[PDB]
């Protein structure tokens, strides 16, 4: 299969952005999705355990919609790459990348 993302996206300072990825061309069960901002963990959506949000993003992330993540109160420090890491049963990994530019405002 393959992972499709919005690619390069823009958002206004103080606004919100929905980070989303779509896994296509595989019927394998998605067991977990991790979200990273650059090399830092934002959140984990595990099919059984739900949503883990890292303490530094607790007040700024709204889990979902679905396997996506809503990042709120954007600042210029949120500009950069984000990754969605899909885990598929039994042992697969698919990684998508999004580049966000936060504009002043």
């Amino acid at each position, epitope marked *: 299969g393959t992972i499709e993302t919005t690619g390069n996206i823009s958002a206004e300072k103080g606004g919100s952005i929905i980070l989303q990825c779509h896994l296509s061309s595989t019927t394998a069960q998605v067991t977990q999705v991790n979200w990273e901002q650059q090399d830092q963990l934002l959140a984990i959506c595990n099919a059984d*355990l739900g949503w883990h949000i*890292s303490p530094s993003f*607790k007040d700024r992330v709204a889990p979902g919609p679905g396997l996506g993540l809503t990042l709120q109160s954007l600042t210029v420090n949120d500009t950069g790459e984000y990754f969605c890491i899909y885990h598929t049963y039994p042992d697969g990994t698919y990684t998508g990348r999004i580049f966000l530019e936060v504009l002043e405002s």
Partner: antibody
Amino acid sequence: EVQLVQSGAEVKKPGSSVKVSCKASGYTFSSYVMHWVRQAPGQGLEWIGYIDPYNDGAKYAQKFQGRVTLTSDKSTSTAYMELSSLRSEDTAVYYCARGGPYGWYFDVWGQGTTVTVSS
Amino acid sequence: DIQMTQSPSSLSASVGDRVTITCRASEHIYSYLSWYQQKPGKVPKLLIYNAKTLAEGVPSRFSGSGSGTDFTLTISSLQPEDVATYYCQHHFGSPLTFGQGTRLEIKR
């Protein structure tokens, strides 16, 4: 330093319920979930569930779903574990353990609460 | 449910020995495995999370390795304070489950 201080030992009759508390200090209570894990005498560790104080969302192991309730009070930074319909096999040390920043592992543990279930 | 099989169940070692404990998961759990130390009559303590990341304050003689289904906890040079039971735990589904533990004692 982070500390989790649990309530004292409990002695309960079969069929009753027990409610244990876990008071957190030294960190922002709502930024981390609180898990519960128990250990029967001479046995291994068994996870019960967690409460997320940020949104009052609880997750339970299927083995305890419907018999345990996990709650939290942000005003006092306290988590609670209420286990009902107690049986002698529920005799164990019950720990609260903070969920770590990067996933579902247990990074800080309370001192434990002994619960004896007996007639 | 994901089952965790730890081996050996018990190990006798001398101070200064290299100790290896293994943990096998019944499903591929990527690097979502943590290790705990429990001294007798004491509370469990996190040693390693995410298969290889040392927890704060844990000495360098402890290291974790592996991924997928097979994981190892190594103590490079055993110290007397390392006498404990060690547990692995996956964190890739519900219920979160632990291995049955490895009891470490000093050989004499």
